[PDB]
């Protein structure tokens, strides 16, 4: 089978680089074709046959090369360039892709806006208590989020997810849950989550009382 | 306009088998090839094979050792893949996509399939509010949402006011719990101004337990 590889797997660069990726086959093939795909979402052509751009393709995607050696160019990248870019090819059975560039943008720093919230009322009800804490739209993807409970910093007891990047400003999110029993819940009144970010001059605390 | 719309998530046991439909539109389903594709994050793409509609010759990647079949039904413009013997390693996402031509792209491609493959038992998901407070106002905005814990497998899919809100929505991967159940949360950021006088409804969907879930989100009183 024809071995695609492309190079680099990933790579960060910022609105109007001119980014440039290969895709390498084994062996020689008539063509490739590229596609674009965004997380979560199915991939979509991008180029067919080495050089022709797709139906809706911006003119600033090109692509060039013959036999094993082929490259897809950005010339002036935008933030919904975001995606992981794929090489392909079918001149010789079974079809293969190339293992995807994951392109991410850089841009300014973004302090993140913090949000914390109780749990609700139908899940104490159910002896749960789960308190998320969401930092919103910032830049870069590295916060760190800790939970503290009556001051008291927790270990344990928490976890996290972070949003792939922003199509369309560029930044990233992150939802931190902290799980406790009902019971525990209610042992404690302080419930607070501090987060540091190179965007803040002083660490975040967002924090209320249990039963306010 | 060209429409490959699938069949929802499923779980399977190992060694069971997996049906996977796709109901093509907007073209003649008999003028172009259907090919199925995998995606196993992060194991990249991965063609099974395809068929034509027309004649009913199907090819396939030989790596799939004859477990898939892919048929079509010219009736009702559907094609489908069927995967036997399901393995752990079976769990992905599957696409439809069409070929419309040797020197084009897959131009159109379904929005895929999920198909996870343990002996896990299926639990739907419980759905919480996430009410805006004062707690939750940055500068004349307000963040609310919905989590939605202990499911499983995945996916569990997030829409707004069915779909009419979908500025400043972050619907966030989900993480796995201790116990091996899923949790996962989705916010909006909205104005603060309007909370009295707009509705906010997350509406969750767990097709693999057959859960539908639309929950008001109010502000705290």
């Known amino acids: 089978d024809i071995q695609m590889t492309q190079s680099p797997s990933s790579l960060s660069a910022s609105v109007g680089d001119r980014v440039t990726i290969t895709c390498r086959a084994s062996?020689?093939?008539?063509?490739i074709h590229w596609y674009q795909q965004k997380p979560g979402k199915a991939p979509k052509p991008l180029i067919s046959?080495?050089?022709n751009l797709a139906s809706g393709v911006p003119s600033r995607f090109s692509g060039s090369g013959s036999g094993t050696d082929f490259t897809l160019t950005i010339s002036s990248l935008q933030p919904e360039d975001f995606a992981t870019y794929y090489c392909?090819?079918?001149?010789?059975?079974?079809?293969?892709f190339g293992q995807g560039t994951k392109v991410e943008i850089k841009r300014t720093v973004a302090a993140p806006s913090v949000f914390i919230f109780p749990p609700s009322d139908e899940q104490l009800k159910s002896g749960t208590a789960s308190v998320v804490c969401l930092l919103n739209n910032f830049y870069p993807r590295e916060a760190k989020v800790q939970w503290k409970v009556d001051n008291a910093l927790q270990s344990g007891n928490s976890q996290e997810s972070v949003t792939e990047q922003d199509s369309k400003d560029s930044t990233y999110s992150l939802s931190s849950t902290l799980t406790l029993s009902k019971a525990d819940y209610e042992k404690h009144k302080v419930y607070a989550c501090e987060v540091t970010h190179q965007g803040l001059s002083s660490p975040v605390t967002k924090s209320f009382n249990r039963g306010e | 306009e060209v429409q490959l719309v699938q069949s929802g998530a499923e779980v399977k046991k190992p060694g069971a088998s997996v049906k996977v439909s796709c109901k093509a539109s907007?073209?003649?389903?008999?003028?172009?090839?259907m090919h199925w594709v995998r995606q196993a994050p992060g194991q990249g793409l991965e063609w099974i094979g395809g068929?034509?509609?027309?004649?009913?010759?199907?090819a396939y990647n030989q790596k799939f050792k004859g477990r898939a079949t892919i048929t079509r039904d010219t009736s009702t413009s559907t094609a489908y893949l069927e995967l036997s013997s399901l393995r752990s390693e079976d769990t992905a996402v599957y696409y439809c996509?069409?070929?419309?031509?040797?020197?084009?792209?897959?131009?159109?491609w379904g929005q895929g399939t999920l198909v996870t493959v343990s002996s896990a038992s299926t639990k739907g998901p419980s759905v919480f509010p996430l009410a805006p407070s004062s707690k939750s106002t940055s500068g004349g905005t307000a963040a609310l949402g919905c989590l939605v814990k202990d499911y499983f497998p995945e996916p569990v899919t997030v829409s707004w006011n069915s779909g009419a809100l979908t500025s400043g929505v972050h619907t966030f991967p989900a993480v796995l719990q201790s116990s091996g159940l899923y949790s996962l949360s989705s916010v909006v950021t909205v104005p603060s101004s309007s909370l009295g006088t707009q509705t906010y409804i997350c509406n969750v969907n767990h097709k693999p337990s057959n859960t539908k879930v639309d929950k008001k989100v109010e502000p705290k009183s």
């Open positions: 996509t069409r070929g419309y031509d040797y020197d084009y792209a897959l131009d159109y």
């Open positions: 907007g073209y003649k389903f008999t003028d172009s090839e």
């Open positions: 068929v034509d509609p027309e004649t009913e010759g199907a």
């Open positions: 062996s020689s093939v008539e063509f």
């Open positions: 046959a080495t050089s």
């Open positions: 392909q090819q079918w001149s010789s059975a079974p079809w293969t």
